């Protein structure tokens, strides 16, 4: 039981950055869009329809007054109805990405990097940091992401949902019952990835990632003696590797959908190379 002074300061800054840039109540997420009240080409559609399952979520909006609006998506009836929630998704993702950019900006180690590497790191980790943050508001009991007044509920077994990598990721990560400190260190490890395409200061970044990883391993050693947390550090590191694979996969779905039904916001176009 004992972290170095340098480690304590590292966690403190990370936690301070998280508190300053993660609006956990989503109180500032507003003015978003809502769903209205040959052969090769067709092959693309068959694929796109497969990439939207199992993304399907119902949406709930709780008003301050106590009222509730609930949106149930349409069944795949072969068209463009499957894209009803994309504009809203684009607004939510953009909102999350801005919070992720702000997170990175307040970190001293990030600000010291060249502007080009800051861009390269953000492009590479925006999806990942977003999902890590979403996991903290994910209710595994109800299969719902509780985003302040907004709730996104998975469409109603487990074995079937666990087939979707991103879905399995959320349930698996939630089961670990991580502390805020561990989530923020995961975000830092993912952010400072030396192997993102376009990074020039690959050396400094690699050195930074290692220090965040050592800090995470130390934090776990100092606070997790329970036999329920054996190999926790390694499980986290393995999950981060999986998240990187999921990121690449989701990026390929995004481009595919964008190709046939453009919907990405200008910030998203920059982040994912559209």
């Amino acid at each position: 039981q004992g972290l170095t002074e340098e480690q304590r300061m590292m966690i403190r800054e990370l936690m301070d950055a998280q508190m300053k840039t993660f609006d956990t109540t989503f109180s500032h997420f507003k003015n978003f869009r809502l769903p209205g009240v040959s052969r090769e080409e067709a092959a693309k559609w068959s694929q796109v329809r497969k990439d939207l399952c199992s993304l399907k979520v119902s949406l709930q909006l709780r008003g301050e007054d106590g009222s509730v609006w609930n949106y149930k998506p349409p069944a795949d009836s072969g068209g463009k109805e499957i894209f009803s929630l994309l504009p809203h998704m684009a607004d939510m993702s953009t909102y999350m990405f801005k919070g992720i950019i702000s997170f990175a900006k307040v970190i001293s180690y990030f600000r010291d990097l060249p502007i080009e590497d800051q861009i390269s790191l953000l492009k590479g980790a925006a999806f990942e940091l977003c999902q890590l943050r979403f996991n903290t508001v994910f209710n595994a009991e109800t299969g719902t992401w509780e985003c302040g007044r907004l709730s996104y509920c998975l469409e109603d077994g487990f074995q079937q949902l666990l087939l979707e990598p991103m879905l399995k990721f959320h349930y698996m990560l939630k089961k670990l019952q991580l502390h805020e400190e561990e989530y923020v260190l995961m975000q830092a490890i993912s952010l400072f990835s030396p192997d993102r395409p376009g990074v020039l200061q690959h050396r400094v970044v690699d050195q930074l990632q290692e220090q965040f990883a050592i800090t995470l391993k130390s934090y776990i050693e100092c606070n997790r003696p329970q036999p329920a947390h054996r190999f926790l550090f390694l499980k986290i590191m393995a999950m981060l590797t999986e998240l990187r694979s999921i990121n690449a996969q989701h990026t390929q779905r995004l481009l595919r959908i964008q190709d046939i039904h453009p919907f990405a916001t200008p910030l998203m176009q920059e982040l994912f190379g559209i």
Binding site: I101, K105, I115, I119, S120, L122, K123, G198, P266, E270
Partner: peptide
């Protein structure tokens, strides 16, 4: 020329705080 192809990111990074 990363900055030139990512105007928004560039702007957001320059704004700071």
């Amino acid at each position: 020329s990363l900055t030139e192809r990512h105007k928004i990111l560039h702007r957001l990074l320059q704004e700071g705080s």
